[PDB]
Write a structure and sequence with these properties.
homodimer, about 180 residues, alpha/beta, 6 helices, 5 strands, about 15% strand, binds zinc ion, Carbonic_anhydrase (chains A, B), carbonate dehydratase activity (chains A, B), Carbonic_anhydrase_sf (chains A, B), zinc (chains A, B), metal-binding (chains A, B)
Chain lengths: ~180, ~180
């Protein structure tokens, strides 16, 4: 059985076990956006750890949960949609210990790409841009502090929207407040 | 209680109820990456719907789960890290019906920003770039098909990594295969 088949299969079983679900509002009912990491350990974990339930928040996830730009990015656009289209009033940026964006570099990714038959010329072309995500990621806490700053100083983001910074431990699920944005 | 206080509070309760949890591998154990939407309705839902458990996959989320670029983005970088650093062998891009990005436009976001006291000059500066996310998002299915294409044609992504396209219904949780990438 392929991974697709397993998903198809699991979905069938899911629909059987969940025959009639209540329609939820499309807008987050706590008016909050969470930005966090793609880390496998946070899946079906992080939200329970912060007491966030289905229908309550938008959740935005990328490797290292970073905003290093004050222009636009996938994450930034997600926040604009959250605020302006979906009524979000608070942003929580939540990094995690042992992120492994910490010990990821353009060198190591480059090496891996070469192994995978990626053209060296292509690796060089993108190395500089890629650096902005993986090499600038020094430390989880620093990244949180910096990310909270970059969202704040974004000219498209209203001054009356608090931006908080949190750190979650991927094993224990302990959350520690880094920045209170009120 | 503020939203931060609620989170702090819930975390305390979470740690009490979950005193000692088994450490999981930092790498996804099914070697799969899921790209999906930030939609409030998919939180604590989408993963169960596809039978994906904690520790099995990386999950990447942005408004409209779109890859329109063959350069770099938050989503793309997340996929590179997944494959090269974390051993991911398959990518599933999963859009949803009633996506908020369909009826989001630069006009509507602009209007909202103007309301919020954002400088008109700033709105005009970003309008062209912003267009690439919100205006190009025509239809969920078309976005899935196009996103699967843009990941495929990305020169940094190996040819031997299948890219699948799925559609989930945000109410029922029914998943339908759009593209099989094997
Ligand atoms: Zn991480
Ligand atoms: Zn959506």
């Amino acid at each position: 059985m392929s991974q697709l088949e397993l998903i198809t299969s699991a979905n069938q079983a899911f629909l059987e076990a969940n025959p009639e679900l209540t329609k939820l509002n499309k807008a987050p009912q706590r008016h909050i956006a969470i930005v966090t990491c793609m880390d496998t350990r946070l899946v079906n974990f992080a939200e329970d750890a912060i007491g966030v339930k289905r229908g309550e928040a938008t959740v935005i996830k990328a490797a290292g949960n970073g905003i290093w730009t004050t222009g636009l990015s996938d994450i930034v656009v997600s926040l604009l949609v959250s605020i302006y289209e979906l009524g979000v009033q608070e942003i929580f940026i939540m990094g995690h210990e042992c992120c492994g964006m910490t010990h990821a570099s353009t060198d190591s990714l480059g090496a891996q790409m070469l192994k995978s038959g990626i053209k060296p010329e292509d690796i060089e072309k993108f190395k500089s841009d890629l650096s902005k995500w993986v090499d600038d990621f020094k430390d989880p806490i620093d990244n949180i502090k910096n990310s909270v700053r970059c969202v704040r100083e974004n000219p498209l983001i209203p001054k009356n929207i608090p931006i908080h910074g949190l750190l979650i431990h991927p094993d224990t699920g302990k959350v520690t407040t880094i920045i209170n944005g009120y």
